């Protein structure tokens, strides 16, 4: 399948070269997979989600996304126009308030929630969790991410936006999950992207168009935007049967575009997520 005039990041993930604008992907499109977006919520009524999104959990007075961040990330995972995996099922877990903040204890509870809640959902092709969040190093936060991964969920986490080594941030620094840095449309490391040995992969993160609250759209930047590209890619590849939740991060690294990014510090992987789809 070909989506013309796609957002640059979608075109990038199906291309061996920057500078194109059509996204190419297998029409299975993540059908039968599920992606949990653990964030500020999801505006599930947005036409871009086509009934495939729903809120399953909140720790606050509403499950609605009063911020936009979670809706944007969910759109990059699975919206019809802005998403990588256009037929996946999206489940929202609101661990962040409408200012985008959340206590680590709440975030940990949300991760353990997903590890159990997947047993209440139909995801025959597999389960992914996208975590566009983080703060300073916490062994308890890392352990929660490790448990979620161990339970059979492909966990993708943001590297962070400090232009610093991600070893000092959580859940970015957890070795067993997939830690995602950000790149721009010219294949440069995004100016804010964290780096370091704990990164597994880069995805598009600068000037990413996606869904927003109020039935709208906007372009924003962050490792928060790169992470759902990788989460959606994992769901898409799992639906194709090419990999599993336990092996998807490694498979994405195996099949990535290699050595194509600029300003990658010595010791950080130079790997850009790529779907290897041959139309």
mmCIF file of C-alpha atoms in Angstrom:
data_model
loop_
_atom_site.group_PDB
_atom_site.id
_atom_site.type_symbol
_atom_site.label_atom_id
_atom_site.label_comp_id
_atom_site.label_asym_id
_atom_site.label_seq_id
_atom_site.Cartn_x
_atom_site.Cartn_y
_atom_site.Cartn_z
ATOM 1 C CA UNK A 1 0.000 0.000 0.000
ATOM 2 C CA UNK A 2 1.077 3.587 -0.678
ATOM 3 C CA UNK A 3 -0.023 6.700 1.221
ATOM 4 C CA UNK A 4 0.811 9.777 -0.820
ATOM 5 C CA UNK A 5 1.749 13.089 0.804
ATOM 6 C CA UNK A 6 2.419 11.335 4.090
ATOM 7 C CA UNK A 7 4.112 12.964 7.086
ATOM 8 C CA UNK A 8 7.859 12.861 6.550
ATOM 9 C CA UNK A 9 8.431 10.405 9.400
ATOM 10 C CA UNK A 10 6.108 7.793 7.928
ATOM 11 C CA UNK A 11 7.806 8.136 4.549
ATOM 12 C CA UNK A 12 11.186 7.895 6.283
ATOM 13 C CA UNK A 13 10.417 4.610 8.017
ATOM 14 C CA UNK A 14 9.636 2.915 4.678
ATOM 15 C CA UNK A 15 12.579 4.416 2.780
ATOM 16 C CA UNK A 16 16.285 3.799 2.288
ATOM 17 C CA UNK A 17 16.689 7.559 1.675
ATOM 18 C CA UNK A 18 15.502 10.804 3.255
ATOM 19 C CA UNK A 19 13.573 13.338 1.240
ATOM 20 C CA UNK A 20 10.560 11.361 0.027
ATOM 21 C CA UNK A 21 6.914 11.817 0.945
ATOM 22 C CA UNK A 22 5.065 8.530 0.265
ATOM 23 C CA UNK A 23 4.650 5.894 2.996
ATOM 24 C CA UNK A 24 4.742 2.277 1.770
ATOM 25 C CA UNK A 25 3.531 -0.577 3.957
ATOM 26 C CA UNK A 26 1.869 -3.979 3.902
ATOM 27 C CA UNK A 27 -1.917 -3.629 3.939
ATOM 28 C CA UNK A 28 -2.216 -5.883 7.007
ATOM 29 C CA UNK A 29 -1.320 -2.611 8.798
ATOM 30 C CA UNK A 30 -1.028 -4.050 12.311
ATOM 31 C CA UNK A 31 -4.487 -5.650 12.262
ATOM 32 C CA UNK A 32 -4.863 -8.014 15.201
ATOM 33 C CA UNK A 33 -2.180 -6.296 17.292
ATOM 34 C CA UNK A 34 -2.709 -3.909 20.193
ATOM 35 C CA UNK A 35 -0.706 -0.881 21.332
ATOM 36 C CA UNK A 36 -1.069 0.646 24.784
ATOM 37 C CA UNK A 37 -0.269 4.361 24.899
ATOM 38 C CA UNK A 38 0.702 5.149 28.487
ATOM 39 C CA UNK A 39 0.445 8.923 28.621
ATOM 40 C CA UNK A 40 -2.022 11.827 29.131
ATOM 41 C CA UNK A 41 -4.881 9.831 27.558
ATOM 42 C CA UNK A 42 -6.280 9.598 24.027
ATOM 43 C CA UNK A 43 -9.133 11.554 22.432
ATOM 44 C CA UNK A 44 -10.702 8.363 21.132
ATOM 45 C CA UNK A 45 -13.535 10.246 19.376
ATOM 46 C CA UNK A 46 -11.058 11.792 16.920
ATOM 47 C CA UNK A 47 -12.151 10.725 13.398
ATOM 48 C CA UNK A 48 -8.533 9.761 12.715
ATOM 49 C CA UNK A 49 -8.858 6.772 15.087
ATOM 50 C CA UNK A 50 -11.899 5.287 13.298
ATOM 51 C CA UNK A 51 -13.269 3.641 16.433
ATOM 52 C CA UNK A 52 -10.034 1.696 17.022
ATOM 53 C CA UNK A 53 -8.986 3.721 20.101
ATOM 54 C CA UNK A 54 -10.370 3.496 23.610
ATOM 55 C CA UNK A 55 -9.412 4.556 27.117
ATOM 56 C CA UNK A 56 -8.989 1.591 29.461
ATOM 57 C CA UNK A 57 -7.562 3.192 32.620
ATOM 58 C CA UNK A 58 -7.025 6.513 34.342
ATOM 59 C CA UNK A 59 -5.625 7.516 37.733
ATOM 60 C CA UNK A 60 -7.280 10.979 37.637
ATOM 61 C CA UNK A 61 -10.773 12.496 37.649
ATOM 62 C CA UNK A 62 -11.181 11.881 33.905
ATOM 63 C CA UNK A 63 -9.786 9.537 31.290
ATOM 64 C CA UNK A 64 -9.964 12.304 28.691
ATOM 65 C CA UNK A 65 -6.787 13.801 27.250
ATOM 66 C CA UNK A 66 -6.872 17.427 28.372
ATOM 67 C CA UNK A 67 -3.294 17.984 27.164
ATOM 68 C CA UNK A 68 -2.908 16.615 23.615
ATOM 69 C CA UNK A 69 0.420 14.820 24.070
ATOM 70 C CA UNK A 70 -1.092 11.338 24.430
ATOM 71 C CA UNK A 71 -3.435 11.910 21.493
ATOM 72 C CA UNK A 72 -0.479 12.977 19.342
ATOM 73 C CA UNK A 73 1.562 9.904 20.284
ATOM 74 C CA UNK A 74 -1.427 7.600 19.707
ATOM 75 C CA UNK A 75 -1.918 9.203 16.296
ATOM 76 C CA UNK A 76 1.652 8.351 15.311
ATOM 77 C CA UNK A 77 1.125 4.742 16.414
ATOM 78 C CA UNK A 78 -2.144 4.106 14.652
ATOM 79 C CA UNK A 79 -4.203 6.944 13.183
ATOM 80 C CA UNK A 80 -5.446 6.550 9.612
ATOM 81 C CA UNK A 81 -3.395 9.465 8.225
ATOM 82 C CA UNK A 82 -0.613 9.992 10.758
ATOM 83 C CA UNK A 83 -0.022 6.439 11.985
ATOM 84 C CA UNK A 84 2.486 3.691 11.277
ATOM 85 C CA UNK A 85 0.116 0.767 12.038
ATOM 86 C CA UNK A 86 -3.164 1.999 10.614
ATOM 87 C CA UNK A 87 -5.298 -0.999 11.688
ATOM 88 C CA UNK A 88 -3.953 -1.652 15.196
ATOM 89 C CA UNK A 89 -6.130 -1.391 18.292
ATOM 90 C CA UNK A 90 -5.130 1.500 20.584
ATOM 91 C CA UNK A 91 -5.614 1.391 24.367
ATOM 92 C CA UNK A 92 -5.087 4.507 26.475
ATOM 93 C CA UNK A 93 -3.729 4.429 30.028
ATOM 94 C CA UNK A 94 -3.737 7.906 31.590
ATOM 95 C CA UNK A 95 -0.796 8.038 34.008
ATOM 96 C CA UNK A 96 -0.052 11.720 33.283
ATOM 97 C CA UNK A 97 -2.287 14.616 34.283
ATOM 98 C CA UNK A 98 -3.462 17.293 31.869
ATOM 99 C CA UNK A 99 -0.284 19.285 32.529
ATOM 100 C CA UNK A 100 1.733 16.285 31.333
ATOM 101 C CA UNK A 101 3.044 15.390 34.808
ATOM 102 C CA UNK A 102 2.793 12.181 36.802
ATOM 103 C CA UNK A 103 4.215 10.583 39.909
ATOM 104 C CA UNK A 104 6.523 7.608 39.431
ATOM 105 C CA UNK A 105 4.249 5.524 41.671
ATOM 106 C CA UNK A 106 1.354 6.151 39.268
ATOM 107 C CA UNK A 107 3.497 5.412 36.213
ATOM 108 C CA UNK A 108 4.657 2.121 37.776
ATOM 109 C CA UNK A 109 1.053 1.188 38.545
ATOM 110 C CA UNK A 110 0.155 1.908 34.923
ATOM 111 C CA UNK A 111 2.870 -0.398 33.611
ATOM 112 C CA UNK A 112 1.809 -3.239 35.884
ATOM 113 C CA UNK A 113 -1.782 -2.539 34.811
ATOM 114 C CA UNK A 114 -0.874 -3.122 31.154
ATOM 115 C CA UNK A 115 0.981 -6.342 31.979
ATOM 116 C CA UNK A 116 -2.261 -7.739 33.427
ATOM 117 C CA UNK A 117 -4.837 -5.929 31.284
ATOM 118 C CA UNK A 118 -3.558 -7.415 28.029
ATOM 119 C CA UNK A 119 -5.112 -10.675 29.264
ATOM 120 C CA UNK A 120 -8.492 -8.913 29.001
ATOM 121 C CA UNK A 121 -7.969 -7.881 25.360
ATOM 122 C CA UNK A 122 -7.911 -9.663 22.004
ATOM 123 C CA UNK A 123 -4.448 -9.174 20.514
ATOM 124 C CA UNK A 124 -3.688 -12.386 18.615
ATOM 125 C CA UNK A 125 -0.775 -10.776 16.759
ATOM 126 C CA UNK A 126 0.839 -9.351 19.906
ATOM 127 C CA UNK A 127 0.977 -6.450 22.328
ATOM 128 C CA UNK A 128 3.091 -3.274 22.388
ATOM 129 C CA UNK A 129 3.369 -0.452 24.926
ATOM 130 C CA UNK A 130 4.526 3.059 24.020
ATOM 131 C CA UNK A 131 5.962 5.174 26.875
ATOM 132 C CA UNK A 132 6.663 8.747 25.762
ATOM 133 C CA UNK A 133 7.612 9.815 29.274
ATOM 134 C CA UNK A 134 10.413 9.737 31.796
ATOM 135 C CA UNK A 135 12.403 11.457 34.487
ATOM 136 C CA UNK A 136 15.537 10.940 36.530
ATOM 137 C CA UNK A 137 17.003 7.508 37.182
ATOM 138 C CA UNK A 138 14.831 5.185 39.279
ATOM 139 C CA UNK A 139 15.520 1.491 39.732
ATOM 140 C CA UNK A 140 11.836 0.948 40.570
ATOM 141 C CA UNK A 141 10.678 2.587 37.327
ATOM 142 C CA UNK A 142 13.183 0.554 35.310
ATOM 143 C CA UNK A 143 12.066 -2.623 37.063
ATOM 144 C CA UNK A 144 8.428 -1.904 36.203
ATOM 145 C CA UNK A 145 9.361 -1.469 32.536
ATOM 146 C CA UNK A 146 11.369 -4.700 32.696
ATOM 147 C CA UNK A 147 8.363 -6.541 34.173
ATOM 148 C CA UNK A 148 6.064 -5.227 31.451
ATOM 149 C CA UNK A 149 8.506 -6.424 28.780
ATOM 150 C CA UNK A 150 8.982 -9.791 30.516
ATOM 151 C CA UNK A 151 5.199 -10.292 30.589
ATOM 152 C CA UNK A 152 5.110 -10.434 26.774
ATOM 153 C CA UNK A 153 4.739 -6.773 25.750
ATOM 154 C CA UNK A 154 7.077 -4.988 23.347
ATOM 155 C CA UNK A 155 8.012 -1.920 25.426
ATOM 156 C CA UNK A 156 9.217 1.183 23.580
ATOM 157 C CA UNK A 157 10.367 4.144 25.685
ATOM 158 C CA UNK A 158 11.552 7.667 24.919
ATOM 159 C CA UNK A 159 15.260 8.347 25.372
ATOM 160 C CA UNK A 160 14.564 11.840 26.723
ATOM 161 C CA UNK A 161 15.036 15.401 25.505
ATOM 162 C CA UNK A 162 18.064 16.602 27.480
ATOM 163 C CA UNK A 163 20.812 16.243 24.828
ATOM 164 C CA UNK A 164 22.473 14.046 27.449
ATOM 165 C CA UNK A 165 23.347 10.423 28.127
ATOM 166 C CA UNK A 166 20.101 8.491 28.661
ATOM 167 C CA UNK A 167 21.801 6.320 31.318
ATOM 168 C CA UNK A 168 20.622 8.915 33.869
ATOM 169 C CA UNK A 169 16.917 8.740 32.962
ATOM 170 C CA UNK A 170 14.121 6.219 33.506
ATOM 171 C CA UNK A 171 12.641 4.161 31.992
ATOM 172 C CA UNK A 172 15.098 5.112 29.183
ATOM 173 C CA UNK A 173 18.021 3.458 31.012
ATOM 174 C CA UNK A 174 16.350 0.044 31.453
ATOM 175 C CA UNK A 175 18.401 -2.373 29.296
ATOM 176 C CA UNK A 176 15.609 -4.831 28.495
ATOM 177 C CA UNK A 177 13.219 -2.349 26.822
ATOM 178 C CA UNK A 178 13.566 -0.521 23.502
ATOM 179 C CA UNK A 179 14.966 2.979 24.084
ATOM 180 C CA UNK A 180 14.246 5.380 21.219
ATOM 181 C CA UNK A 181 16.184 8.480 20.189
ATOM 182 C CA UNK A 182 14.956 11.147 17.753
ATOM 183 C CA UNK A 183 16.090 12.236 14.270
ATOM 184 C CA UNK A 184 15.029 14.966 11.834
ATOM 185 C CA UNK A 185 13.983 14.993 8.194
ATOM 186 C CA UNK A 186 17.594 15.492 7.047
ATOM 187 C CA UNK A 187 18.803 12.408 8.951
ATOM 188 C CA UNK A 188 20.421 14.464 11.712
ATOM 189 C CA UNK A 189 20.172 13.564 15.365
ATOM 190 C CA UNK A 190 17.482 15.826 16.771
ATOM 191 C CA UNK A 191 19.044 18.712 18.678
ATOM 192 C CA UNK A 192 17.377 17.686 21.955
ATOM 193 C CA UNK A 193 17.684 13.906 21.640
ATOM 194 C CA UNK A 194 19.411 12.014 24.402
ATOM 195 C CA UNK A 195 22.108 9.550 23.346
ATOM 196 C CA UNK A 196 24.327 6.865 24.851
ATOM 197 C CA UNK A 197 24.881 3.130 24.893
ATOM 198 C CA UNK A 198 21.392 2.445 26.286
ATOM 199 C CA UNK A 199 19.711 3.636 23.075
ATOM 200 C CA UNK A 200 18.555 0.840 20.783
ATOM 201 C CA UNK A 201 17.186 2.761 17.804
ATOM 202 C CA UNK A 202 16.308 6.178 16.391
ATOM 203 C CA UNK A 203 12.990 7.237 14.922
ATOM 204 C CA UNK A 204 11.565 10.433 13.414
ATOM 205 C CA UNK A 205 11.147 13.002 16.173
ATOM 206 C CA UNK A 206 11.524 16.562 14.835
ATOM 207 C CA UNK A 207 8.459 18.307 13.349
ATOM 208 C CA UNK A 208 6.058 15.352 13.490
ATOM 209 C CA UNK A 209 2.480 15.958 12.356
ATOM 210 C CA UNK A 210 -0.185 13.961 14.195
ATOM 211 C CA UNK A 211 -3.583 14.143 15.882
ATOM 212 C CA UNK A 212 -4.385 16.636 18.633
ATOM 213 C CA UNK A 213 -7.292 17.229 20.982
ATOM 214 C CA UNK A 214 -10.388 19.031 19.778
ATOM 215 C CA UNK A 215 -10.409 16.902 16.636
ATOM 216 C CA UNK A 216 -7.358 18.775 15.368
ATOM 217 C CA UNK A 217 -3.769 18.153 14.210
ATOM 218 C CA UNK A 218 -0.396 19.744 14.877
ATOM 219 C CA UNK A 219 3.330 19.222 14.416
ATOM 220 C CA UNK A 220 5.530 18.926 17.537
ATOM 221 C CA UNK A 221 8.980 17.535 18.349
ATOM 222 C CA UNK A 222 10.491 15.194 20.903
ATOM 223 C CA UNK A 223 11.718 11.727 21.636
ATOM 224 C CA UNK A 224 8.047 11.377 22.634
ATOM 225 C CA UNK A 225 7.299 11.528 18.889
ATOM 226 C CA UNK A 226 10.005 9.053 17.857
ATOM 227 C CA UNK A 227 8.867 6.415 20.366
ATOM 228 C CA UNK A 228 5.405 5.797 18.817
ATOM 229 C CA UNK A 229 6.969 5.391 15.367
ATOM 230 C CA UNK A 230 8.906 2.450 16.821
ATOM 231 C CA UNK A 231 5.916 1.121 18.793
ATOM 232 C CA UNK A 232 3.729 1.217 15.684
ATOM 233 C CA UNK A 233 6.503 -0.386 13.637
ATOM 234 C CA UNK A 234 6.742 -3.226 16.178
ATOM 235 C CA UNK A 235 2.980 -3.809 16.004
ATOM 236 C CA UNK A 236 3.128 -3.822 12.195
ATOM 237 C CA UNK A 237 6.034 -6.303 12.117
ATOM 238 C CA UNK A 238 4.395 -8.552 14.729
ATOM 239 C CA UNK A 239 1.202 -8.670 12.640
ATOM 240 C CA UNK A 240 3.331 -9.734 9.666
ATOM 241 C CA UNK A 241 4.733 -12.554 11.815
ATOM 242 C CA UNK A 242 8.297 -11.351 11.308
ATOM 243 C CA UNK A 243 9.073 -10.958 15.020
ATOM 244 C CA UNK A 244 7.636 -11.251 18.541
ATOM 245 C CA UNK A 245 7.248 -8.939 21.527
ATOM 246 C CA UNK A 246 10.399 -10.375 23.093
ATOM 247 C CA UNK A 247 12.515 -10.039 19.942
ATOM 248 C CA UNK A 248 11.062 -7.002 18.151
ATOM 249 C CA UNK A 249 13.527 -4.392 19.429
ATOM 250 C CA UNK A 250 16.446 -6.547 18.322
ATOM 251 C CA UNK A 251 14.747 -7.262 14.992
ATOM 252 C CA UNK A 252 14.162 -3.554 14.383
ATOM 253 C CA UNK A 253 17.845 -2.912 15.119
ATOM 254 C CA UNK A 254 18.844 -5.842 12.839
ATOM 255 C CA UNK A 255 16.807 -4.439 9.947
ATOM 256 C CA UNK A 256 17.397 -0.703 10.509
ATOM 257 C CA UNK A 257 19.011 1.726 8.109
ATOM 258 C CA UNK A 258 22.597 1.766 9.401
ATOM 259 C CA UNK A 259 25.138 4.565 9.468
ATOM 260 C CA UNK A 260 22.869 7.153 7.847
ATOM 261 C CA UNK A 261 22.404 9.639 10.719
ATOM 262 C CA UNK A 262 24.668 12.603 11.427
ATOM 263 C CA UNK A 263 25.801 13.929 14.820
ATOM 264 C CA UNK A 264 25.573 10.506 16.472
ATOM 265 C CA UNK A 265 28.082 10.516 19.369
ATOM 266 C CA UNK A 266 30.772 7.860 19.378
ATOM 267 C CA UNK A 267 29.350 4.893 21.285
ATOM 268 C CA UNK A 268 25.678 5.478 20.372
ATOM 269 C CA UNK A 269 24.050 3.253 17.745
ATOM 270 C CA UNK A 270 23.613 4.763 14.280
ATOM 271 C CA UNK A 271 20.386 2.917 13.472
ATOM 272 C CA UNK A 272 17.171 4.367 12.023
ATOM 273 C CA UNK A 273 13.906 2.407 12.206
ATOM 274 C CA UNK A 274 12.936 0.920 8.831
ATOM 275 C CA UNK A 275 10.067 -1.371 7.821
ATOM 276 C CA UNK A 276 11.941 -3.063 4.931
ATOM 277 C CA UNK A 277 8.705 -3.163 2.963
ATOM 278 C CA UNK A 278 9.198 -4.046 -0.694
ATOM 279 C CA UNK A 279 6.104 -2.975 -2.632
#
